[PDB]
Amino acid sequence: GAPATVTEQGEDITSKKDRGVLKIVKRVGNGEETPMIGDKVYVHYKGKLSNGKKFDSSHDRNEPFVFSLGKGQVIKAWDIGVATMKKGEIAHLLIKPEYAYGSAGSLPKIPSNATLFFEIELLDFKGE
C-alpha cells in the first residue's frame, strides 16, 4: 500500500541523501511559493506507524493542525517535507526514525526506531 509505494517510488528530499525522508506528490498544488522557515503553516494530515493500522488524524478532531515551520515544533521530517510543498498540495511522506523520534522513541504513542508514514494536505501558510 501507500508506504511501500513511497519506499519504491518516492524522492529522497534529505540533504544527506540517506533516504530518511521519502516523498510522493499525490495531488499537485498552485503557486510557486513553498513556505519558508518561520512561516505559520496550516495542514490536514493522516499519520501512522508505517507497520501500524490506525492513524492519528487532524480530521478526527475536525480542526487543522497549525505550526511554525523550521522552529522545531514538529519532527525534522515535517520541517524538511512541508518546506517543499505548494499550497493545495497533497503529499505522502515516509520517514526513518532519525528524522522522527529516533531510538529513544516517544512512548506511549511512538516506539523506539519507528518508521512513520503521513499524508499531508497543505491548506495555507502566512509569513512571520
Ligand SMILES: COc1cc2cc(c1OC)OCC[C@@H](C)n1cc(nn1)C[C@H](C)COC(=O)[C@@H]1CCCCN1C(=O)[C@H]2C1CCCCC1
Ligand atoms: C509524540 O507525540 C505525538 C505525536 C503525534 C501526535 C500527537 C502526539 O502527542 C502530542 O498528538 C496528536 C494531537 C495533536 C493535536 N497534536 C500534534 C502535535 N501536538 N498536538 C504535535 C506533536 C507534539 C509532534 O508531532 C509531530 O511532530 C508529528 C507531525 C505533526 C503531526 C503529529 N506528529 C506525530 O508524530 C503524531 C504521530 C504520528 C504517527 C502516529 C502516532 C502519532
